[PDB]
Write a protein that holds these residues in place. Structure first.
Motif, PDB file in Angstrom:
ATOM      1  N   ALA A  44       0.840  -1.204   0.000  1.00  0.00           N
ATOM      2  CA  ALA A  44       0.000   0.000   0.000  1.00  0.00           C
ATOM      3  C   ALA A  44       0.875   1.254   0.000  1.00  0.00           C
ATOM      4  O   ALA A  44       1.967   1.259   0.571  1.00  0.00           O
ATOM      5  N   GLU A  45       0.384   2.315  -0.634  1.00  0.00           N
ATOM      6  CA  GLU A  45       1.232   3.446  -1.019  1.00  0.00           C
ATOM      7  C   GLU A  45       0.903   4.794  -0.351  1.00  0.00           C
ATOM      8  O   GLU A  45       1.651   5.769  -0.501  1.00  0.00           O
ATOM      9  N   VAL A  46      -0.206   4.832   0.388  1.00  0.00           N
ATOM     10  CA  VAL A  46      -0.690   6.046   1.048  1.00  0.00           C
ATOM     11  C   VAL A  46      -0.648   5.841   2.577  1.00  0.00           C
ATOM     12  O   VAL A  46      -0.992   4.763   3.060  1.00  0.00           O
ATOM     13  N   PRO A  47      -0.213   6.849   3.339  1.00  0.00           N
ATOM     14  CA  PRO A  47      -0.100   6.696   4.797  1.00  0.00           C
ATOM     15  C   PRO A  47      -1.458   6.744   5.524  1.00  0.00           C
ATOM     16  O   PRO A  47      -2.264   7.645   5.249  1.00  0.00           O
ATOM     17  N   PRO A  48      -1.706   5.784   6.424  1.00  0.00           N
ATOM     18  CA  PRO A  48      -2.948   5.737   7.214  1.00  0.00           C
ATOM     19  C   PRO A  48      -3.359   7.053   7.890  1.00  0.00           C
ATOM     20  O   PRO A  48      -4.561   7.313   8.000  1.00  0.00           O
ATOM     21  N   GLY A 103     -16.734   3.890  -0.459  1.00  0.00           N
ATOM     22  CA  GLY A 103     -15.697   2.872  -0.468  1.00  0.00           C
ATOM     23  C   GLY A 103     -14.683   3.011  -1.595  1.00  0.00           C
ATOM     24  O   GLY A 103     -15.048   3.063  -2.784  1.00  0.00           O
ATOM     25  N   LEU A 104     -13.406   3.053  -1.214  1.00  0.00           N
ATOM     26  CA  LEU A 104     -12.300   3.217  -2.158  1.00  0.00           C
ATOM     27  C   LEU A 104     -11.173   2.216  -1.945  1.00  0.00           C
ATOM     28  O   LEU A 104     -10.881   1.822  -0.812  1.00  0.00           O
ATOM     29  N   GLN A 105     -10.530   1.834  -3.047  1.00  0.00           N
ATOM     30  CA  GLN A 105      -9.365   0.949  -3.029  1.00  0.00           C
ATOM     31  C   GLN A 105      -8.382   1.344  -4.139  1.00  0.00           C
ATOM     32  O   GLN A 105      -8.556   2.382  -4.790  1.00  0.00           O
ATOM     33  N   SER A 106      -7.374   0.497  -4.358  1.00  0.00           N
ATOM     34  CA  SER A 106      -6.304   0.724  -5.342  1.00  0.00           C
ATOM     35  C   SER A 106      -5.591   2.052  -5.107  1.00  0.00           C
ATOM     36  O   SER A 106      -5.378   2.833  -6.036  1.00  0.00           O
ATOM     37  N   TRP A 107      -5.232   2.293  -3.849  1.00  0.00           N
ATOM     38  CA  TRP A 107      -4.495   3.492  -3.452  1.00  0.00           C
ATOM     39  C   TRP A 107      -3.074   3.491  -4.015  1.00  0.00           C
ATOM     40  O   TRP A 107      -2.412   2.445  -4.047  1.00  0.00           O
ATOM     41  N   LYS A 108      -2.628   4.668  -4.459  1.00  0.00           N
ATOM     42  CA  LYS A 108      -1.353   4.831  -5.166  1.00  0.00           C
ATOM     43  C   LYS A 108      -0.560   6.040  -4.658  1.00  0.00           C
ATOM     44  O   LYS A 108      -1.146   7.026  -4.197  1.00  0.00           O
ATOM     45  N   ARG A 109       0.769   5.961  -4.754  1.00  0.00           N
ATOM     46  CA  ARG A 109       1.661   7.036  -4.318  1.00  0.00           C
ATOM     47  C   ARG A 109       1.220   8.375  -4.887  1.00  0.00           C
ATOM     48  O   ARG A 109       1.100   8.524  -6.105  1.00  0.00           O
ATOM     49  N   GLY A 110       0.969   9.341  -4.009  1.00  0.00           N
ATOM     50  CA  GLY A 110       0.557  10.666  -4.438  1.00  0.00           C
ATOM     51  C   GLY A 110      -0.931  10.941  -4.301  1.00  0.00           C
ATOM     52  O   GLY A 110      -1.315  12.098  -4.112  1.00  0.00           O
ATOM     53  N   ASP A 111      -1.761   9.891  -4.400  1.00  0.00           N
ATOM     54  CA  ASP A 111      -3.220  10.000  -4.219  1.00  0.00           C
ATOM     55  C   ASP A 111      -3.549  10.782  -2.962  1.00  0.00           C
ATOM     56  O   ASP A 111      -2.996  10.515  -1.885  1.00  0.00           O
ATOM     57  N   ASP A 112      -4.449  11.746  -3.098  1.00  0.00           N
ATOM     58  CA  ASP A 112      -4.867  12.530  -1.949  1.00  0.00           C
ATOM     59  C   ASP A 112      -6.244  12.083  -1.441  1.00  0.00           C
ATOM     60  O   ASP A 112      -7.246  12.209  -2.155  1.00  0.00           O
ATOM     61  N   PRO A 113      -6.271  11.551  -0.216  1.00  0.00           N
ATOM     62  CA  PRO A 113      -7.502  11.068   0.426  1.00  0.00           C
ATOM     63  C   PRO A 113      -8.629  12.102   0.458  1.00  0.00           C
ATOM     64  O   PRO A 113      -9.754  11.767   0.078  1.00  0.00           O
ATOM     65  N   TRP A 114      -8.338  13.325   0.895  1.00  0.00           N
ATOM     66  CA  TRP A 114      -9.339  14.391   0.899  1.00  0.00           C
ATOM     67  C   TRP A 114      -9.869  14.687  -0.513  1.00  0.00           C
ATOM     68  O   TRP A 114     -11.063  14.935  -0.701  1.00  0.00           O
ATOM     69  N   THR A 115      -8.966  14.658  -1.496  1.00  0.00           N
ATOM     70  CA  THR A 115      -9.305  14.901  -2.899  1.00  0.00           C
ATOM     71  C   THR A 115     -10.177  13.776  -3.438  1.00  0.00           C
ATOM     72  O   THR A 115     -11.254  14.035  -3.987  1.00  0.00           O
ATOM     73  N   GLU A 116      -9.710  12.534  -3.276  1.00  0.00           N
ATOM     74  CA  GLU A 116     -10.490  11.347  -3.642  1.00  0.00           C
ATOM     75  C   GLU A 116     -11.895  11.390  -3.036  1.00  0.00           C
ATOM     76  O   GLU A 116     -12.879  11.013  -3.687  1.00  0.00           O
ATOM     77  N   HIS A 117     -11.967  11.859  -1.788  1.00  0.00           N
ATOM     78  CA  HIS A 117     -13.220  12.010  -1.061  1.00  0.00           C
ATOM     79  C   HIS A 117     -14.181  12.921  -1.821  1.00  0.00           C
ATOM     80  O   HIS A 117     -15.316  12.526  -2.103  1.00  0.00           O
ATOM     81  N   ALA A 118     -13.708  14.118  -2.171  1.00  0.00           N
ATOM     82  CA  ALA A 118     -14.503  15.110  -2.908  1.00  0.00           C
ATOM     83  C   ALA A 118     -14.802  14.692  -4.351  1.00  0.00           C
ATOM     84  O   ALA A 118     -15.820  15.092  -4.927  1.00  0.00           O
ATOM     85  N   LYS A 119     -13.904  13.897  -4.926  1.00  0.00           N
ATOM     86  CA  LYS A 119     -14.083  13.375  -6.267  1.00  0.00           C
ATOM     87  C   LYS A 119     -15.278  12.431  -6.302  1.00  0.00           C
ATOM     88  O   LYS A 119     -16.138  12.552  -7.171  1.00  0.00           O
ATOM     89  N   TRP A 120     -15.343  11.512  -5.337  1.00  0.00           N
ATOM     90  CA  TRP A 120     -16.320  10.420  -5.386  1.00  0.00           C
ATOM     91  C   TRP A 120     -17.588  10.613  -4.562  1.00  0.00           C
ATOM     92  O   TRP A 120     -18.647  10.111  -4.935  1.00  0.00           O
TER      93      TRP A 120
END
Ligand SMILES: [Zn+2]
Length: 99
Positions: free
Chosen positions: A31-35, A60-77
């Motif tokens: 996994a590539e993103v810090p908890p 629900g999200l998966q396939s986390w990758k280096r650089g992915d922003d959790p807050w951003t992904e949140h607003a995206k989905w």
């Protein structure tokens, strides 16, 4: 006009960031993103891979990758998640949706 968004968290117990962090005790090596970033953005870890869900909207999200922003992904989905909006504001969400 208008149904209203319900005010109850999908999983109220996971409402605590500290508790959300505990769930990442087995957050994988590959996994590539810090908890910390994940838990801060409202996600907690489910299953044994890299699946997360938001304690409030249950997005629900998966396939986390280096650089992915959790807050951003949140607003995206999950643009309407009330936890996301209280934490980051109307402008931030609108900003991610418009791109
Ligand atoms: Zn959410």
């Amino acid at each position: 006009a208008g149904a209203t968004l319900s005010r109850g968290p999908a999983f109220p117990g996971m409402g605590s960031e500290e508790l959300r962090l505990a769930s990442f005790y087995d957050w994988p090596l590959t996994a590539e993103v810090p908890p910390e970033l994940l838990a801060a953005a409202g996600f907690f870890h489910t299953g044994h891979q890299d699946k997360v869900r938001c304690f409030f909207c249950y997005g629900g999200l998966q396939s986390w990758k280096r650089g992915d922003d959790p807050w951003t992904e949140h607003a995206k989905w999950f643009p309407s998640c009330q936890f996301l909006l209280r934490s980051k504001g109307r402008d931030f969400v609108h900003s991610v949706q418009e791109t």
